Amino acid sequence: SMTSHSWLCDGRLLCLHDPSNKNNWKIFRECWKQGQPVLVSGVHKKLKSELWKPEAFSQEFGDQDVDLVNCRNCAIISDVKVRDFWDGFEIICKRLRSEDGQPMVLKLKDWPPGEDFRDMMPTRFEDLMENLPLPEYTKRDGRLNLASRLPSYFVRPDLGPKMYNAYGLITAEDRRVGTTNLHLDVSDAVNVMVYVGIPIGEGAHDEEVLKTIDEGDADEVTKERIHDHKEKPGALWHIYAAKDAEKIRELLRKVGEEQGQENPPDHDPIHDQSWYLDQTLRKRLYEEYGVQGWAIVQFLGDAVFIPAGAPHQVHNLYSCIKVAEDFVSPEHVKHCFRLT
Numbered sequence: 001s002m003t004s005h006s007w008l009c010d011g012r013l014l015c016l017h018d019p020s021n022k023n024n025w026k027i028f029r030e031c032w033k034q035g036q037p038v039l040v041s042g043v044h045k046k047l048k049s050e051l052w053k054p055e056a057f058s059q060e061f062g063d064q065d066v067d068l069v070n071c072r073n074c075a076i077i078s079d080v081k082v083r084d085f086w087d088g089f090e091i092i093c094k095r096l097r098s099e100d101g102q103p104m105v106l107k108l109k110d111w112p113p114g115e116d117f118r119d120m121m122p123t124r125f126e127d128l129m130e131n132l133p134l135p136e137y138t139k140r141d142g143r144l145n146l147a148s149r150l151p152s153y154f155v156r157p158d159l160g161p162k163m164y165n166a167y168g169l170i171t172a173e174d175r176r177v178g179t180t181n182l183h184l185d186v187s188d189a190v191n192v193m194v195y196v197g198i199p200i201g202e203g204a205h206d207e208e209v210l211k212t213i214d215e216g217d218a219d220e221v222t223k224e225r226i227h228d229h230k231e232k233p234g235a236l237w238h239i240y241a242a243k244d245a246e247k248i249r250e251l252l253r254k255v256g257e258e259q260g261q262e263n264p265p266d267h268d269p270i271h272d273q274s275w276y277l278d279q280t281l282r283k284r285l286y287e288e289y290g291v292q293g294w295a296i297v298q299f300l301g302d303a304v305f306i307p308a309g310a311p312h313q314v315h316n317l318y319s320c321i322k323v324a325e326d327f328v329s330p331e332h333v334k335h336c337f338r339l340t
C-alpha cells in the first residue's frame, strides 16, 4: 500500500517513504543539489524500540552528573543526576518544579558528552548507524561523505552521533520559545526522531499542540498525518535556504535595535543562537525581506536532512529523543571551506 515518495510544504519538500530503498538517491539528489531540506519517514520501524526508551536511559546511566537548561528563561541547572531529567520525561508529577510550583520545561545539555556516544552506548551506536537513510551520504565511510577525505582548508565535523533530549513546550506563552534557537551548521546533518513521550498528569494537553502547528504555518497534508493516521508528532522545525541567511541577519539586527539591544552593525545574530522566530517575526521576514521558509513537523521515525549553511530552529510539541549525524556531501562542501 506504499509509494516511493510524496510532497509536503505544497510541493516544496520531498518526503521519502521507505528508509532502506536502494533507489532513494535518484529522487533525493536533485532536491538536495537545489539546497532543499528532505524528510524520510519510517526509520522507527527499522530500530530496536527497547534501546530508545527513557526508562532504559535512567536505569543504565542515571548516576552520571549533568547540567540542564530551563527552556523558558535559559537558566542553567548545574551538576544534577541525569535520572532527575529522565524520570520526569513523561510523568509530570516527577518533573522538577519552578519556585512557583509549575512542572518545568528542561533540555538535557551535551549528553552523552562531546564525542563519547559510541564508547558509552555501543549497541545504540550500531542500531542507529546501520539504519540511517541515504547511507552513501550519511555513514562515516560512505562514498559521498567527504568528512574523512578533506584537508585542513575545510572545517571537519566532530565524530557523532549527538543525542538531543528535551521536554515538550506546554503553554500559550511557551508558543514563542525555542527548544533549539535559530542557528546554522557548516556541515550537512540528518536528525532522527527515535522516541516521542506524550505525558500523563497534565495529560489532556492535546489542544494547545493543534493551535501551535496551525500558527506554525504547517501545510494541510501535515495536518492530515495527526487526524487521519494518528502518528505521534514530536517537534516543529522552521528551515531557511542558505542563500537567505544574510537577509535573516538584517531582520534580527533591526529587531535587536528596536528592542534596545546595543550591538555593532556587523554582529552575527544567527551565530549568537539567541533568537526564536515566532509567528510575528516569521511574517515580518516574509513581508519586509521576501524570505519564505519550510515549516516541518517531525513525527516519530522521521529523519530530517538539514543542508549545510541553512538557518534552522526547533520547537518540541512533546518530550523528544532525537539522534543526529553530521556529514559532508559534495553538493554543499563550499559551506565549510576556510577561504574566499
Ligand SMILES: Oc1c(F)cc(F)cc1[C@H]1CCNN1
Pocket (backbone or CB within 6 Å): 002, 003, 004, 005, 017, 018, 021, 022, 023, 024
Ligand atoms: O520503496 C518503494 C516501495 F516500497 C514501493 C514502491 F512502489 C517503490 C519504492 C521506491 C523507493 C525508491 N525507489 N523505489
Ligand SMILES: [Cl-]
Pocket (backbone or CB within 6 Å): 035, 242, 309, 331, 332
Ligand atoms: Cl548550498
Ligand SMILES: [Cl-]
Pocket (backbone or CB within 6 Å): 120, 121, 122, 123, 124, 125
Ligand atoms: Cl548501548
Ligand SMILES: [Cl-]
Pocket (backbone or CB within 6 Å): 025, 133, 134, 135, 136, 137
Ligand atoms: Cl545513498
Ligand SMILES: [Cl-]
Pocket (backbone or CB within 6 Å): 179, 180, 181, 273
Ligand atoms: Cl539553543
Ligand SMILES: [Mn+2]
Pocket (backbone or CB within 6 Å): 183, 184, 185
Ligand atoms: Mn544544529
